[PDB]
């Protein structure tokens, strides 16, 4: 029964998921003056040429674009990571208004939305084993600002009418996630968590500095989705973001000067 309402929102999650108040929770504010350049970080390696998208699912919290992760097809390596992380899904978090929606913030600035490309460490064999490890997942986070349309996002926007409500899915093959990346792979990185229940502390966060631009019409179509199931009272899927959590004993590292 967790969600993003007044009665079941992020301030309530700790009652069923006490790790909500833990030492490495996400998201966080990225203070750009306190993040230190780490010359030992490697360039990110984003290898998405062989990505196999399968399906898009409205899960009642967001929509997920799911990939075939039964082989090393779309992988994230390098940067702060040891070994190979396989892409399993991507999703977004967004606002009711353009002035909010991102989960990470930059010097307390909120973006209109945030893309999460979720990857799991292949040394743990499957995603369910990986989420039980402190280095199990790598999530690539990309901010969205409202301005020019993102052409590589339109195939996602155009299928959302077919998955309006919770539990609906649609075939979503041959989608190329390279079309969601910005030009620069400059990033910030820190150890954190899933941002939704069960809030497991299993994520290496890699947040790109350069946002992508999407149009007002693209993000308006995200905000026509529903949290509810078919035939239930309509509750628009908006403001599906967790706010920034305490940094505690953590350092955010920059890949760039
Ligand atoms: N916003 S985010 O990128 O941090 C993100 C949040 C949640 C998830 C996610 O995979 N969850 C659904 C399953 N659960 C994991 C799970 C638990 C037990 C058994 C198996 C799996 C969470 C992935 C990324
Ligand atoms: Zn997310």
UniProtKB/Swiss-Prot annotation:
Subcellular location(s) per record: Cytoplasm; Cell membrane
PROSITE patterns for the chain: ALPHA_CA_1, ALPHA_CA_2
Cellular component terms (Gene Ontology): apical part of cell; cytoplasm; cytosol; extracellular exosome; myelin sheath; plasma membrane
EC id: 4.2.1.1, 4.2.1.69
Residues reported in the UniProt entry to bind substrate: 195-196
InterPro entries attached to this UniProt entry: CA_dom (IPR001148), CA_dom_sf (IPR036398), Carbonic_anhydrase_a-class (IPR023561), Carbonic_anhydrase_a-class_CS (IPR018338)
Stated consequence of mutating residue 116 to E: Strongly reduced activity
Keywords: Acetylation, Cell membrane, Cytoplasm, Disease variant, Lyase, Membrane, Metal-binding, Osteopetrosis, Phosphoprotein, Zinc
Subunit note: Interacts with SLC4A4. Interaction with SLC4A7 regulates SLC4A7 transporter activity. Interacts with SLC26A6 isoform 4 (via C-terminus cytoplasmic domain).
Record's function text: Catalyzes the reversible hydration of carbon dioxide. Can also hydrate cyanamide to urea. Stimulates the chloride-bicarbonate exchange activity of SLC26A6. Essential for bone resorption and osteoclast differentiation. Involved in the regulation of fluid secretion into the anterior chamber of the eye. Contributes to intracellular pH regulation in the duodenal upper villous epithelium during proton-coupled peptide absorption.
Identification of the protein by name: Carbonic anhydrase 2
């Amino acid at each position: 029964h967790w969600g993003y309402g007044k009665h079941n929102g992020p301030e309530h999650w700790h009652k069923d998921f006490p790790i909500a108040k833990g030492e490495r929770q996400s998201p966080v504010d990225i203070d750009t003056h306190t993040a230190k350049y780490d010359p030992s970080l490697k360039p990110l390696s984003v290898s998405y040429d062989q990505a196999t998208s399968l399906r898009i699912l409205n899960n009642g919290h967001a929509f997920n674009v799911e990939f075939d992760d039964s082989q090393d097809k779309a992988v994230l390596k390098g940067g702060p990571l040891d070994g190979t992380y396989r892409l399993i899904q991507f999703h977004f978090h967004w606002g009711s208004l353009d002035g909010q929606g991102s989960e990470h913030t930059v010097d307390k600035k909120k973006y209109a939305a945030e893309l999460h490309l979720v990857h799991w460490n292949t040394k743990y064999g499957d995603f369910g084993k990986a989420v039980q490890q402190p280095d199990g997942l790598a999530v690539l986070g990309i901010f969205l600002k409202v301005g020019s349309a993102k052409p590589g996002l339109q195939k996602v926007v155009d299928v959302l009418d077919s998955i309006k409500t919770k539990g609906k899915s649609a075939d979503f093959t041959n989608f190329d996630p390279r079309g969601l990346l910005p030009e620069s792979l400059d990033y910030w990185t820190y150890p954190g968590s899933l941002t939704t229940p069960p809030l497991l502390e299993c994520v290496t966060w890699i947040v790109l500095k350069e946002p992508i631009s999407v149009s007002s019409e693209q993000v308006l179509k995200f905000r026509k989705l529903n949290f509810n199931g078919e035939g239930e009272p309509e509750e628009l899927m908006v403001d599906n973001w967790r706010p920034a959590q305490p940094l505690k004993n953590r350092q955010i590292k920059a890949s760039f000067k």
